[PDB]
Design a protein around this ligand. Structure first.
Ligand SMILES: CCCCCCCC/C=C/CCCCCCCC(=O)OC[C@H](O)CO
Ligand SMILES: CCCCCCCC/C=C/CCCCCCCC(=O)OC[C@H](O)CO
Ligand SMILES: CCCCCCCC/C=C/CCCCCCCC(=O)OC[C@H](O)CO
Ligand SMILES: CCCCCCCC/C=C\CCCCCCCC(=O)OC[C@H](O)CO
Ligand SMILES: CCCCCCCC/C=C\CCCCCCCC(=O)OC[C@H](O)CO
Ligand SMILES: CCCCCCCC/C=C\CCCCCCCC(=O)OC[C@H](O)CO
Ligand SMILES: CCCCCCCC/C=C\CCCCCCCC(=O)OC[C@H](O)CO
Ligand SMILES: CCCCCCCC/C=C\CCCCCCCC(=O)OC[C@H](O)CO
Ligand SMILES: CCCCCCCC/C=C\CCCCCCCC(=O)OC[C@H](O)CO
Length: 522
């Protein structure tokens, strides 16, 4: 069963990792708030935060491991050290020159990414400085992602799954203990990121030495295998990470809005990163390997059947989560962030961006299902072309929404674009005659919609009997939040079982048995 790969140890490590990342953002919100200095940091954190997410969500492993597994097995450990050396060298060289260039041209990078910060000479100079300190992370996090994939190919798993923790450990310790000794104190966060990057790599190196895969990076532009790996890294991200690239571009527009517009968008996107990340990783861990296996063997039925099951798991979990985040946007922002320098105005500005983001949770998760359907057949070009159309239309919605809705309209542009990205991938899988659904989708969706209203009704009613969400310290707020969340989860799954949906049966679908057997026992 393909579902035995989710509860394979790291299930308690997804928990520890998500909790500790929450703990970082809560601590950052307390000590630094959502203003000038966090604005500057969150701009300089944009590209690092994008790469961290790839390594924490195991995305590069999902891509590199099949390449390295194929070419360890057919043609050798001795040749695989060489391949890794050539892959490692290209990554290092390419990213070393980018990092150095970006550090010496840091003010000009901010002129492109946050031009509205040029009205504020002191805010601009700080952003440039923070970006200079955090560039080396881009190299550091990329080598760590490669190292983690080598370990994962050799079936270690636990050491690379833990390394993402180290960044949040670094930033928490710096924010709590080192920040007073810096001026301005946000400089501690920047150094914490680069130190976190050093730790995320150095943590994994000794275990690589044990498997004989610690090789000194070298350059050889004639290795076509090394060139395709690095060259198709970007296009592969772009086809599955348009929302995250749109945050970076929206920063241009947000640089002209009120103080904290960048921060309010950051905190709202982290809150949504929880259902996005957890569900996206789980769906990816199950889909891409098995779908690639079926495509390799011509198993058209099991390709099509796992496709349909995953897209039903998608709507089953994303739709209630999306509505729940919207309904609970206020309670979530007050209970998790409204402490210290993060005020109730900050909480409302974060809530409004979250409600906008909420519209696109379902699209983000459908993309995590539909893009693999192309990637399994070695078609990057179709998701990439869709990605480019989506980026262009996101920026057009910015021009339409920034007026009335400010930073929330820039958030909504990302939300509606994920729904667009997903529907363009479905239309392409149907026109190209690759996926055709199983029967009963309309009945399946209608029971979900009814169960979601039931959940919403219980959610809204629970919010009415509860006090103001700022009442009490953090334990009391969180305890009340868990009472409202448990009531929603219970109502949602209670309504599905009344309407006749078997969650337990859904997890024992026959396609899951044979897909797991066909993939694990290759
Ligand atoms: C609201 C506005 C919506 C606008 C929507 C715009 C259209 C989006 C479609 C993209 C075409 C994708 C086609 C991808 C390539 C198909 C051709 C093909 O199969 O080429 C493979 C090639 O041979 C490999 O080398
Ligand atoms: C890659 C190169 C990027 C750089 C090159 C392109 C730069 C485009 C900047 C546009 C400003 C957008 C923000 C507009 C500032 C005013 C804020 C606003 O829209 O407020 C609404 C209205 O003024 C009251 O309701
Ligand atoms: C399944 C659907 C039903 C679910 C049923 C869940 C039961 C537990 C709920 C507790 C509500 C708590 C109410 C108020 C909690 C805060 C108490 C407080 O101090 O509020 C201020 C006070 O009214 C003046 O001082
Ligand atoms: C503007 C001032 C930029 C100063 C640093 C530029 C070169 C980077 C060196 C450190 C990174 C490699 C170790
Ligand atoms: C590793 C996670 C915990 C790390 C946190 C503990 C402090 C470490 C360093 C302090 C440097 C102080 C620099 C003082 C300011 C110079 C300007
Ligand atoms: C510049 C400073 C950082 C350099 C990091 C180099 C990576 C080490 C070996 C890992 C890849 C080969 C195995
Ligand atoms: C609830 C969310 C709406 C989701 C709607 C998703 C259903 C779309 C149905 C659809 O497009 O059917 C396939 C196509 O029409 C045949 O080629
Ligand atoms: C606010 C919510 C916005 C949501 C936006 C999400 C867009 C995702 C795009 C496509 C997914 C379609 C899902 C699958 C629908 C298949 C329907 C169909 O054709 O059913 C055939 C039937 O089962 C007989 O074979
Ligand atoms: C299981 C239900 C969850 C929480 C109970 C809600 C009541 C507890 C939280 C609200 C009470 C509170 O925070 O009280 C502050 C202060 O201690 C008063 O004097």
């Amino acid at each position: 069963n393909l579902l035995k790969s989710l509860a394979a140890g790291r299930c308690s490590m997804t928990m520890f990792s998500r909790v500790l990342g929450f703990a970082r953002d809560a601590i950052v919100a307390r000590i630094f708030g959502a203003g000038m200095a966090t604005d500057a940091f969150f701009v300089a954190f944009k590209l690092p935060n994008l790469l961290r997410r790839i390594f924490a969500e195991g995305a590069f492993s999902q891509a590199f491991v099949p390449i390295l597994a194929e070419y360890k097995s057919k043609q050798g450990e001795d040749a695989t050290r060489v391949f890794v050396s050539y892959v490692s060298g290209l990554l290092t060289l390419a990213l070393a020159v980018v990092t150095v260039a970006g550090m010496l041209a840091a003010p000009w990078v901010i002129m492109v990414t946050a031009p509205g910060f040029a009205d504020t000479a002191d805010k601009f100079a700080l952003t440039s400085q923070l970006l200079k300190i955090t560039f080396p992370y881009i190299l550091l996090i990329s080598l760590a992602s490669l190292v983690g994939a080598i370990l994962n190919t050799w079936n270690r798993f636990s050491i690379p799954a833990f390394a993402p923790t180290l960044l949040n450990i670094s930033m928490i310790g710096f924010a709590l203990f080192a920040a007073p000794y810096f001026n301005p104190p946000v400089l501690a966060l920047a150094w914490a990121v680069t130190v976190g990057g050093v730790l995320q790599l150095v943590y994994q190196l000794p275990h690589l030495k044990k498997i004989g895969m610690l090789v000194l990076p070298r350059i050889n532009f004639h290795d076509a295998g090394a060139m395709r790996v690095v060259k198709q890294m970007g296009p592969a991200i772009l086809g599955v990470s348009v929302s995250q690239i749109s945050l970076i571009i929206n920063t241009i527009f947000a640089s002209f809005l009120a103080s904290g517009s960048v921060s309010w968008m950051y905190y709202a996107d982290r809150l949504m990163e929880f259902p996005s990340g957890v569900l996206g990783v789980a769906l990816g861990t199950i889909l891409l390997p098995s779908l690639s296996k079926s495509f390799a063997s011509g198993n058209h039925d099991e390709y099509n059947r796992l496709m349909d099951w995953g897209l039903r798991l998608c709507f089953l979990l994303a739709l209630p989560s999306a509505v729940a985040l919207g309904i609970l946007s206020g309670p979530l922002t007050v209970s998790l962030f409204q402490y210290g320098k993060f005020t109730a105005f900050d909480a409302l500005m974060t809530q409004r961006a979250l409600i906008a983001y909420s519209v696109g949770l379902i699209g983000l998760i459908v993309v995590k299902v539909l893009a693999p359907g192309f990637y399994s057949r070695q078609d990057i070009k179709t998701p990439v072309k869709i990605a480019i159309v989506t980026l262009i239309l996101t920026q057009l919605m910015n021009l339409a929404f920034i007026g009335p809705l400010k930073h929330a309209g820039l958030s909504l542009s990302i939300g509606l674009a994920a729904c667009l990205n997903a529907s363009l991938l479905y239309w392409q899988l149907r026109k190209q005659k690759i996926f055709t659904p199983q029967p009963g989708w309309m009945a399946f969706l209608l029971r979900l919609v009814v169960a979601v209203l039931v959940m919403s009704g219980v959610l809204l009613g629970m919010l009415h009997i509860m006090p103001e969400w700022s009442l009490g310290t953090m334990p009391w707020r969180l305890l009340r939040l868990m009472a409202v969340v448990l009531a929603g989860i219970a109502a949602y799954f209670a309504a599905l079982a009344v309407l006749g949906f078997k969650v337990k049966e859904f997890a024992r679908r026959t396609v899951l048995e044979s897909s797991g057997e066909n993939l694990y026992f290759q």
